[PDB]
Amino acid sequence: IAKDKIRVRLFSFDVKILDQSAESIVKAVQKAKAQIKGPIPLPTKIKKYTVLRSPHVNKKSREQFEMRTHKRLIDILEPTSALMDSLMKLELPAGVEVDIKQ
Amino acid sequence: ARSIKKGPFIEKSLYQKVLSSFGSEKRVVIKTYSRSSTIIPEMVSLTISVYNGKTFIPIYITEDLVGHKLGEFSPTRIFRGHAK
């Protein structure tokens, strides 16, 4: 299969900056000249909350909200120490977060 | 209906009060709050006044009271047998 892979999961609330960080990372690694497996989209996680509207009796009337989490995945072939160091060194706009496994 | 592996429940303060009464020949009344304490067979033949939230209701404990709880014999709300 492969000697080892770097599994990096991108978590965000916002699709735009999540995507932006995704191409930022893919460009950053192709600069380092490594073969890459495609940014693969994981299912979005939706948590729906239903709350009352009035601060008192009125029960038939309510309101619904979501929290939406968007997830992407990157796989890195043939891990390199310099490649991992650069990945950890990369700075990142707020709202998109990274999880790394060797 | 506790598990067997837990054994009966008796509060510790009530339990060493029971031991002190057991080592005393005087059969003094014990006033208590822990209605949830099980009647352990050792403490048969005592007199305990349990608090039902208003007053201390007394009981003489016989052998057959064993296995119950203290609150079982101190009524907490009174009905006058008529709803008027």
Binding site: T50, K60, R62 | -
Partner: protein, 131 residues
């Protein structure tokens, strides 16, 4: 990678999805690695499923394989019906008019509603009892 399956299609229903594979043969049907008759136990639903073939007078000369999941028994029957229709279309343009005449190309976008707050169900409401 023989690609013996000459054509392939997909079909959907309430919440079920089926993948259909046309092969050369005597018309045998294989569903989820099980016999078609043993899988779809209701002969009604089996006739339901085989209706596109009887209409396109092609049963008995093409073998079928089906990989179907989701939905209930009726949903899966409808899904495989739709898959057969789409596979026949992918095979031949000649069957297009008759299949569309029977409505086998337009699939039942009809799906279950969602429950709404203040309602016991999608449309049922709580009892009023005004008196």
């Amino acid at each position: 990678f023989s690609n013996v399956n000459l054509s392939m299609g997909t079909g959907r229903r309430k919440s079920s999805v089926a993948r259909v594979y046309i092969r050369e043969g005597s018309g045998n049907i294989k569903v989820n690695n099980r016999d078609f008759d043993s899988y779809i136990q209701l002969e009604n639903l089996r006739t339901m499923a085989l209706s596109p073939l009887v209409l396109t007078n092609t049963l008995g000369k093409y073998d079928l394989y089906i990989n179907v999941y989701g939905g209930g028994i009726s949903g899966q029957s409808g899904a495989i019906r739709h898959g057969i229709s789409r596979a026949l279309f992918k095979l031949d343009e000649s069957n297009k008019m008759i299949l569309r005449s029977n409505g086998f190309l337009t699939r039942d976008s009809r799906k279950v509603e969602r429950k709404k707050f203040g309602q016991k169900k999608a449309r049922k409401s709580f009892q009023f009892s005004k008196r």
